[PDB]
Amino acid sequence: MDCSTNISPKQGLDKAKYFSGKWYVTHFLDKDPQVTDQYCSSFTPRESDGTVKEALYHYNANKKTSFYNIGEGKLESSGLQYTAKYKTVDKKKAVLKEADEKNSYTLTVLEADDSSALVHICLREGSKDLGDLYTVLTHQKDAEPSAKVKSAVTQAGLQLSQFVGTKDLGCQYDDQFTSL
Numbered sequence: 001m002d003c004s005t006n007i008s009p010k011q012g013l014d015k016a017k018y019f020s021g022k023w024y025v026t027h028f029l030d031k032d033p034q035v036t037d038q039y040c041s042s043f044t045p046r047e048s049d050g051t052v053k054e055a056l057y058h059y060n061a062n063k064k065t066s067f068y069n070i071g072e073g074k075l076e077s078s079g080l081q082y083t084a085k086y087k088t089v090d091k092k093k094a095v096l097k098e099a100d101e102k103n104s105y106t107l108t109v110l111e112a113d114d115s116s117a118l119v120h121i122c123l124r125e126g127s128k129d130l131g132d133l134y135t136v137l138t139h140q141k142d143a144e145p146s147a148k149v150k151s152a153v154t155q156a157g158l159q160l161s162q163f164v165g166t167k168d169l170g171c172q173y174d175d176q177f178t179s180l
C-alpha cells in the first residue's frame with residue numbers, strides 16, 4: 001500500500017509555527033489500515049540545527065491502551081519535511097528499542113499557522129511502505145482547526161469529511177509524556 005507520491009512541504013512556512021507547543025490530531029485520513037483499530041495521537045516536535053526530535057504518543061481507542069515513541073531525523077533541503085528513525089519507549093521515556101536503520105517515517109508539513117497544521121506521514125519498514133496518513137493538528141484537544149488548514153485539506157485534493165474525527169473516539173492523552 002504505497003504512500004502518496006505527490007507530497008512536498010509548503011514553501012514559505014515559518015518553522016517556528018510548526019515546532020511550537022504540542023499537537024493533537026483532530027482528524028486523520030488513512031488510505032489503507034492493516035488494523036481496523038482507530039487511534040488518537042499527540043506529539044511534541046522540536047528542531048535545532050536541522051535536527052528534529054519529537055515525543056510521540058498513540059492511544060488505541062478500541063483497546064484503550066497507549067504506546068510511546070521518540071522520533072529523530074534531519075530536515076530536508078526542501079523545507080519542513082523530515083525522515084525520522086524512532087525509539088520505542090515506556091511512559092517514563094525509558095528506551096525499550098533504539099532507533100534502527102530499516103524502520104522510519106517521513107513527515108511532510110503541508111500547512112501550519114498559529115493554531116493548527118496539516119501534515120502527511122508515510123511509515124516504512126525496509127523496502128515496504130506500511131502506511132500513509134494525513135493528519136489535521138491543533139494545539140489543544142478538540143480545538144477547531146483553522147480556516148487556513150481546512151483550505152489546505154481541500155487544496156491537497158481531499159475532503160475533510162472523509163477523515164476520521166478523533167473527538168468521537170473517546171481519546172485519552174498523556175500530557176505528562178508530551179510536556180517537554
Ligand code: HEM
Nearest residue numbers: 025028035038039040041043056069086088105121123135
Ligand atoms: C490519529 C493519528 C494516527 C493514527 C490513526 C495512527 C495509526 C497508527 C497505527 C495503526 C500504527 C500501527 C500500530 C501497531 O499495530 O503497531 C501506527 C504506528 C506508528 N505511527 Fe501512527 N498514527 C497516528 C499518528 C501518528 C503520528 C502523528 C506520527 C508521527 C509523528 C506517527 C508515527 C507512527 C510510528 C513511528 C509508528 C510505528 C510505531 C511502532 O512500530 O512501534 N503516527 N500508527
